[PDB]
Amino acid sequence: DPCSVTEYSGLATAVSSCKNIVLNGFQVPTGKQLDLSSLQNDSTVTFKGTTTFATTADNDFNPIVISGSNITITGASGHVIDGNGQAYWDGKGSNSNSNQKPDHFIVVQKTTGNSKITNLNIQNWPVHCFDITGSSQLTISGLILDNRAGDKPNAKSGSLPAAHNTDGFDISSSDHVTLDNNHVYNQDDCVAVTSGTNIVVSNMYCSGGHGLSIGSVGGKSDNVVDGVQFLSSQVVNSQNGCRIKSNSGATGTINNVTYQNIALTNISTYGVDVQQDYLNGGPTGKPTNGVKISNIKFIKVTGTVASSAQDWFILCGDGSCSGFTFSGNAITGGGKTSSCNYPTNTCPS
Numbered sequence: 001d002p003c004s005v006t007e008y009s010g011l012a013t014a015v016s017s018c019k020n021i022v023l024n025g026f027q028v029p030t031g032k033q034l035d036l037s038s039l040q041n042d043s044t045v046t047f048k049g050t051t052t053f054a055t056t057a058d059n060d061f062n063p064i065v066i067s068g069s070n071i072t073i074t075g076a077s078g079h080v081i082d083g084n085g086q087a088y089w090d091g092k093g094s095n096s097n098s099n100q101k102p103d104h105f106i107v108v109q110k111t112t113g114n115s116k117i118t119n120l121n122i123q124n125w126p127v128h129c130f131d132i133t134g135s136s137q138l139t140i141s142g143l144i145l146d147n148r149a150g151d152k153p154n155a156k157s158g159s160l161p162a163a164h165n166t167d168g169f170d171i172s173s174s175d176h177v178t179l180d181n182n183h184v185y186n187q188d189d190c191v192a193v194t195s196g197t198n199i200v201v202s203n204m205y206c207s208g209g210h211g212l213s214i215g216s217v218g219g220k221s222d223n224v225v226d227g228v229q230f231l232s233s234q235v236v237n238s239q240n241g242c243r244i245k246s247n248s249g250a251t252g253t254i255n256n257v258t259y260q261n262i263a264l265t266n267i268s269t270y271g272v273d274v275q276q277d278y279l280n281g282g283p284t285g286k287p288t289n290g291v292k293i294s295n296i297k298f299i300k301v302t303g304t305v306a307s308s309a310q311d312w313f314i315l316c317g318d319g320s321c322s323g324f325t326f327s328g329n330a331i332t333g334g335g336k337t338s339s340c341n342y343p344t345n346t347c348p349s
């Protein structure tokens, strides 16, 4: 059965001959990418057994690539997809001057036609997990990203957490993307939308990450975010719950963004963060107004933040923010006075 792949060498043929392909769980040899960019229309790929990856010390290497129209990527019960992160982690993540590691584990580009990815068990990935770009009408649910193994330090990170910059879902230049019922244990942004339209993220279980954050926007290929919805979700043991960041000195657009029904728990620094002073992955303290943020809604954002974090932190640019709505929020716990500068110099406290 050509449609039943037992080894990497049988993948190509399966993708060209079968609309229903079954990966039985093998190891992808070093330097070889699990190429699913040529999937036929209405094709279905099912992950079985344990899929593993050989070690490929290269930043630009992309282990898995998915493309096609009306395609379906799912897994069978008890299946597992290991990214071989333990072999890469050195607690520096995507840092240029660190050990070389695949930046994007899974690249979902050019996926359309009401395609969907569901019920996937992914674990131990290098850096960024999902790189969703140039896709539309796509649905991802029932996903379980577990990178807790990278929480502890190894022989390469010293006292640092092996895993770093392990974004769960990165979305860009996409439209009508829906994320529902997804578990994410990582060390960075649970879900980062640098650009896209009509994006929906609901029933999200983030933990140990940086929370559902927007951006950073600006300075990238695409700096336009219009129509994003974070609904019924839980952010625990994370740096931030709801964060909207923008690169300093850059231009872009962030409109129609709504955080609704978000429960926070044990936030480290920011319960709700909205700043436009990000430079080189770090806050500058001086926000710019190149990126226009408008129509932002914080509805029913409750929960608690660690004593070491601020309930609210809003650092908008000079006249670059407009239309902020706050309703039903109840964030408590912060040991540092909240600070924000829009719409006025007072916050929800």
Ligand SMILES: *[C@@H]1O[C@H](CO)[C@@H](O[C@@H]2O[C@H](CO)[C@@H](O)[C@H](O)[C@H]2NC(C)=O)[C@H](O)[C@H]1NC(C)=O
Pocket: 042, 043, 044, 070, 072
């Ligand atoms: C979308 O893709 C699905 C497959 O995932 C298509 O439904 C399969 O189609 C053939 C008929 O052509 C049947 O033999 C199978 O029973 C189908 N499977 C399922 C799960 O339905 C469906 O036709 C596609 N939709 C469009 C609009 O093309």
